[PDB]
Amino acid sequence: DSDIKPLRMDPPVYPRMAQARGIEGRVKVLFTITSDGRIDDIQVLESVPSRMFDREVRQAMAKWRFEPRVSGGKIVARQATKMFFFKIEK
Amino acid sequence: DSDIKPLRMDPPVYPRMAQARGIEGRVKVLFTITSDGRIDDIQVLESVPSRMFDREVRQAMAKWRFEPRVSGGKIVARQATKMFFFKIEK
Amino acid sequence: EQARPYAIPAGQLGDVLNRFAREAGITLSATPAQTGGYSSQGLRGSFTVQQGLARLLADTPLEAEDQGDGSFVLREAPDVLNMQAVEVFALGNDGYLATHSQIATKTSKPLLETSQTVSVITREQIDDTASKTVQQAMRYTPGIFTGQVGASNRYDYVVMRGFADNSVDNIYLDGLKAMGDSGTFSSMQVDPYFLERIDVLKGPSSVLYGRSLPGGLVALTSKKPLYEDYRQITGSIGNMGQKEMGFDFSGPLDEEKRIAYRLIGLGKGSDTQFDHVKEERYAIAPTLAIDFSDDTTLTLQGYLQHDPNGGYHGGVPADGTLSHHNGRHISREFFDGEPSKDDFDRTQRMFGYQLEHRIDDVWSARQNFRYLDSDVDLSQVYAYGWSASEPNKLNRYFSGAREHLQAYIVDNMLQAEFATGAARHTLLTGLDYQRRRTVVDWRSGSASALDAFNPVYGDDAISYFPDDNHTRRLEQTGVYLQDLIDIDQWRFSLGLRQDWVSVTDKNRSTGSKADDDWEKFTGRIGALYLFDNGLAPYVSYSESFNPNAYSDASGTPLAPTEGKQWELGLKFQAPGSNSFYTASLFHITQENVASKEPQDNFYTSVGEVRSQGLELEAHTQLSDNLKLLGSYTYTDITYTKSLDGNQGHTPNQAPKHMASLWADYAFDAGPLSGLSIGGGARYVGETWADKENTLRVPDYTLVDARIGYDLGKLGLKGLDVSLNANNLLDKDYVASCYSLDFCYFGEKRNVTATVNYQF
Amino acid sequence: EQARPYAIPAGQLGDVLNRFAREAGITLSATPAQTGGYSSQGLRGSFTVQQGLARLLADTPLEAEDQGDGSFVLREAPAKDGDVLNMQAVEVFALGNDGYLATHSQIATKTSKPLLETSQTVSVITREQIDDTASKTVQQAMRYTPGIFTGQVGASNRYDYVVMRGFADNSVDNIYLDGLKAMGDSGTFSSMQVDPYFLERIDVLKGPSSVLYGRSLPGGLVALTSKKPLYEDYRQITGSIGNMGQKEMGFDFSGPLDEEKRIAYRLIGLGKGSDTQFDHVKEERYAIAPTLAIDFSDDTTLTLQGYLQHDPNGGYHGGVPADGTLSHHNGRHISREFFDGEPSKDDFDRTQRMFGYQLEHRIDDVWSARQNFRYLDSDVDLSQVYAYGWSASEPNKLNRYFSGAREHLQAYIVDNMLQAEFATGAARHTLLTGLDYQRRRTVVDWRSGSASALDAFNPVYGDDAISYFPDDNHTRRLEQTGVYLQDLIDIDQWRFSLGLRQDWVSVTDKNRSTGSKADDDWEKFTGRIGALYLFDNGLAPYVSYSESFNPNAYSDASGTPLAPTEGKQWELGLKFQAPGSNSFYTASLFHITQENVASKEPQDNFYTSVGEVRSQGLELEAHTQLSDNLKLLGSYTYTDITYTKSLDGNQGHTPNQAPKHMASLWADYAFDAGPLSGLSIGGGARYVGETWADKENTLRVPDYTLVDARIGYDLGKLGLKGLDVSLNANNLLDKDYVASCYSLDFCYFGEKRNVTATVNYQF
Secondary structure (H helix, E strand, O other), X not given: OEOOEXXXXXXXXXXXXXXXXXXXXXXXXXXXXXXXXXXEEEEEEEEEOOOOOHHHHHHHHHHOEEEOEEOOOOEEOOEEEEEEEEEEOO | OOOOEEEEOOOOOOOOOOOXXXXXXXXXXXXXXXXXXXXXXXXXXXXXXXXXXXXXXXXHHOOOEEEOEEEOOEXXXXXXXXXXXXXXXX | OOOEOOEEOOOOOHHHHHHHHHHHOOEEEEOOOOOOOOOOOOEEOOEOHHHHHHHHOOOOOOOEEOOOOOEEEEOOOOOEEEOOOEEEEEEOXXXXXXXXXXXXXXXXXXXXXXXXXXXXXXXXXXHHOOOOOHHHHOOOOOOEEOOOOOOOOOXXXXXXXXXXXXXXXXXXXXXXXXXXXXXXXXXXXXXHHHOOEEEEEEOOOOOOOOOOEOXXXXXXEOOOOOOOOEOOEEEEEEOOOOEEEEEEEEEEOOOOOOEEEXXXXXXXXXXXXXXXXXXEEEEEEEXXXXXOOOOEEEEEEEEEEEEEEEOOOOOEOOOOOOOOEOOEOOOXXXXXXXXXXXXXXXXEEEXXXXXXXXXXXXXXXXXXXXXXXXXXXXXXXXXXXXXXXXXXXXXXXXXXXXXXEEEEEEEEEEEEEOOOOOOOOEEEEEEEEEEEEEEEEEEEEEEEEEEXXXXXXXXXXXEEOOOXXXXXXXXXXXXXXXXXXXXXXXXXXXXXXXXXXXXXXXEOOOOOEEEEEEEEEEEEEEEEEOOOOOEEEEEEEXXXXXXXXXXXXXXXXXXXXXXXXXXXXEEEOOOOOOEEEEEEEEEEEEEOOOOOOOOOOOOOOOOOEEEEEXXXXXXXXXXXXXXEEEEEEEEEEXXXXXXXXXXXXXXXXXXXXXXXXXXXXXOOOOOOOOEEEEEEEEEEOOEEOOOOOOOEEOOEEEEEEEEEEEOOOOOOOOEEEEEEEEOOOOOOOEEEEEEOOEXXXXXXXXXXXXXXXXX | OOOEEEEOOOOOOHHHHHHHHXXXXXXXXXXXXXXXXXXXXXXXXXXXXXXXXXXXXXXXXXXXXXOOOOOOEEEOOOOOOOOOEEOOOEEEEEEOOOOOOXXXXXXXXXXXXXXXXXXXXXXXXXXXXXXXXXXXXXXXXXXXXXXXXXXXXXXXXOOOOOEEOOEOOOOOOOEEEOOEEOOOOOOOOXXXXXXXXXXXXXXXXXXXXXXXXXXXXXOEEEEXXXXXXXXXXXXXXXXXXXXXXXXXXXXXXXXXXXXXXXXXXXXXXXXXXXXXXXXXXXXXXXXXXXXXXXXXXXXXXEEEEEEEEEEEEEOOOOOEOOOOOOOOEOOEOOOOOXXXXXXXXXXXXXXXXXXXXXXXXXXXXXXXXXXXXXXXEEEEEEEEEXXXXXXXXXXXXXXXXXXXXXXXXXXXXXXXXXEXXXXXXXXXXXXXXXXXXXXXXXXXXXXXXXXXXXXXXXXXXXXXXXXXXOOEXXXXXXXXXXXXXXXXXXXXXXXXXEEEEEEEEEEEEEEOOOOOEOOEEEEEEEXXXXXXXXXXXXXXXXXXXXXXXXXXXXXXXXXOEOOOEEEEEEEEEEEXXXXXXXXXXEEEEEEEEEEOEEEOOOOOOOOEEXXXXXXXXXXXXXXXXXXOOEEEEEEEEEEEEXXXXXXXXXXXXXXXXXXXXXXXXXXXXXXXXXXXXXXXXXXXXXXXXXXXXXXXXOOOEOOEEEEEEEEEXXXXXXXXXXXXXXXXXXXXXOOOOEEEEOOOOOEEEOOOOXXXXXXXXXX
């Protein structure tokens, strides 16, 4: 019948000491979008620079909310993958 | 307690013999996203070059689908505006 | 706690949020996803940080939260919602290369998948190589010989695969035959300045195109209207008193952009390399496109053109150019005719229309129509061999003509595109009709002999032989059919035609009318294969049927010329490179060919002539700057059935070997940005001078060069300048001969400088 | 139905879908929105359109429609069961973090405030400025700054003489590095020099700045701010070749050390040489400077710094009589390449060695701590035969004398600052207390004499015989402790400024040769008050009243030590910057009085106090961004300075080496026009007024204007990316001129033309 439909998915906030000393990088993160609409079982696959951005990516994802997957007649979980790039403008 | 949340918002098709001649344009459009969650009462406010893209835009919008707006816990209709820009690559 | 006063412009909200962020000394953490479509406002003094943010995203559903250290982030919020705007783009659709032609097949199809040898010459080429005639634009294209009457620009002569007879009636303009009467002097010219493409179909094409010859056809492509305001003015000054001014306006008329015009116009001249000679022209081409409903579109077109002067079109003996006469050479200037009696005034009026209609997703009709009205005036004195009595004077004769022509032609095509499960068909069916009336009044006579070195002009006296006036009509109607079947990596081409023709000539000054009819089935079977390589080999067996309107010296008229070509071929485009290679290997056999000899007022028919050879063609865009072009032709042609006495011999003006390279570097960086340097060499092998294989016209290599500079870079936008030199090395040479009394010089160095203004 | 072969490489799916739509000859309508964070990894096979499109968009939730011939649209298919879903990526940007101008100073207020709101005249010289102006010493870098007279010893590059608001006495110890005083010893030869290669900025605090930077002069100070480490790998190699034997390679690598980027290094190196304008002289240096920063938690960072420098050759430091340079001596001139000394008995070998850290710890939302520490160790060696007026018997020869030295210096300094940022309703605070402390110990073995006399034009060298006096050996100690307190209050459109300091100093000098010693202790309370009014406009007047206290360790002709120098200054000011606009204008009006300036004549090993000197004048500075490529620097300096108590019969007179009038303009514009992209032409002229030559004001030194020029070109555009080149020339018109004079017997030549062709290489 359907898939994941995002409802709240506000983005994460650049770390304070990252803008200062313009740093930049990325997080790749594997996760689950529970039948219950919420994010779960977050696994980080890439982190450049290591474990720097993770904690905001996690805290942002907390708040996220979705219409869950429908698979003909029972609502189902969904495994997903997403990439965050952090950047500095000018 | 909520807003519009789009669920299928697939874009309009560049009309042929418009892209053949390499014509760009734009439509501005005022419309309603009903309780129903569908689009209705499509009023086309700017249309450059006149009457070119409108048909494609109306057709696309009529396939769009949303979570309707909720206000003090009752599904409520809601008025909206959007701009489309038609361009040619490269 | 307290506010600052800001001063901020407007623009894609991203930037305005940035300026604000910088100037407020905070940090907004946000994504292009969320500031995207928004595009706006400004900031107008006297805000806390927050309230500024609020007032910036006031008209959007954004809002920015957080604190602690001027760390903010964008989010969402709650009359009328302003959704992000959208940018929908049309993805889909090069330099000297075209991979695509509509002409070969009457339907759009890439060359990789088309089973017939085909070249395309682009605008860019024509203008980079400074080709000033259709004939000259093919100087770099294989299996075509240019220099046939040498420097003469009065007619476009085009020698396909060593077939140099019948060579003027070969040019089609938007897929309709020109409609001049090549049996008179009233043959038409098209100016390059009006063209987008030249497509050259080597080998028989009679199935789609009606009076096609078996060596092939050249197809010109008119340059239609644009749907946004384009305006270009050009000007050009060069040696040999060359002077040219043109303009090319186009655009849409209405607000719905369903109507558009184009207006191309030029005047130009040249004093040639010949003494007392003038070339001079004025032309105007309005075009008007008008969409009727949403599936029927109409294009009205005109081409008025008036040449009050016809350059030089004459020739002199091989005895004095290839050989020394006494001890002298005839100059490669040299005029052979009284300037008092030298007049060539062609006027071409062409109106027509192009009607496209869509019927289903399957069917579609097309109708192309054109009306021709022309008028040619000739006076010309000419040199035929040496005086029997005065030994350094050429004898001379006269040919004069008033001739009015009118002709029309039309082509109705009905095109069904379907499937048969396995395959994909693209099936064509047509009916085409043409008719042409030429009324001529011609006179000949003899004239005074002339010193071939040190001539004295005056003696425009002519002793007129009695007048030969005629009225020639020709009518032709054909029906055709062509399926293009496509399964997997295979493409097949099937094609059938049935021509019916009728030709007369009432000899108004004698009485004699000849009056004949002919009929003929023709067709095309042809299969190709496309390897994942990018490699596409093919065979083709093609036929041609060309009805002719000439007479014998014995009185009786010439039968239609016939043609059978087998060709084996190999095309290669490495998976989307900017390169293409073709290698073609062919075997044409024309029965009944039709020569002239420029001294007679009559044709000779032949009986079969056979041609075979090889063409390698290359275009390669070796980088973002350098483009390259090259060819080698090998031709082996022979009179296999004739009674001139020359059976077994080789035709004249047909080189065995031909080769051409051209390159254009364009600098796009550095000190030298906007600069372009280009050049090429052309090589023509040895040719014969006579059909007895008696005497050889020696081979020649020509160099061409090109410097070019976009003055955009300096500051004046839409403006460039270019300097061209063709035959850079000013070679003095005989290009070819038609016979031992008629040899022609090549164009001496042609330098030209051009100025351009665009939009 | 049927397939053709494709080969499309990989990239932001847009591209790859475009190349595809092209090679299939369909059209395909899509939007960035939908093709955003999708990567593509593209086709190479034979395929059937649909099949190729499908294949292309197989790792995404997209699908391509068709709708008849050509056409095609990106709708979002449902749902491709497969396994894992590939959500669109996302870019999260941080928002809000040109050249010769800088609108903020961290040094001026010991905390980062804009200059429009800082109530004291501060100039900034950027790295870019230094490199464009081809400034080869600190002294030189201020050649275009107003307030500052650069020509104090002319062409000498042994030391950085920096004359602020005409107070040209006592001018060597004006230099602070990363906010701590140098810690040289102005009383000896052991005075340190910082190479500009290692700097990011130079902030100039004019006028009394003692409150925050202890032991500073009333003229103000010059603050070096060194390059620090970067958290993105960056690499650089510099090479330069120039006239006067000039030779120089240096490198600059910075980068992160671990993968969590909690650590970064910066290694800067440099080797340079020059045989100066002067006969038989050399200037040679090597230095290395390693910087390394380590974050301890989320609250704390610690930086380790080192700066090791060797000057095996000392350049030139000498002068010649005014008779023969500003006059004509028995009918010729002394050249600008005249030697003076004797090779093989003339050298200055200096070794500087600096180790230190910077601790920065955020205590909470309001409070913070910073701790800056530097140890210095130094070894100077000197012999210098020199000229001192004309010979009493041979007529064209100069009398000459000798000064030899051996000096071990050792000193350290520290500054602890505790900072509170709170509010008081409408009052915005930034309250700062500190306590700072310096120990310095100089052991000096001096030695001195009379040399042979020397012909001033056609000299014959080789008589390095010397008749010595007794050696003079001392051991010199200075200790200073400060407690200070500075609040910056910011209500509505006002910016107040309020400072309070208490210095305690102590100086001793054992003359180890005599045995006898001079132990002395001093205390003083210093403060400032500054009110600035800022208009929405961009404009800001202000008034400042500020004080200065500077202990001196010097001695009389008799040995009776010199008292500290003191200063009071009233300044009236006007800064203006239009909101947005990249220009900044300041006009400043000042009256400064010093008590006890310590003077010193060359010939002498003693100083003299001067009862009082006063300077009043005006400073106009203007940096403008005249367009997208043209930028400008311009300044005017009016300076009226006078001895107002003096017991030498020069009371009322004006001090020498102080120019009344000086102005300078400098521009540089850099193209992106196709013909000339990356090319830049720049230049400027520099004017200096008359100077006196004389405390007794008898001779005057002519004024002078000098021209400077540069061409620069990014060879990156011409293809060799990262590489760039550069040709400069300083004093392009090659003037031959006397820059200043210390006295009548010591006048110094200005540098001749200095051409310098330079090459770079980035990352």
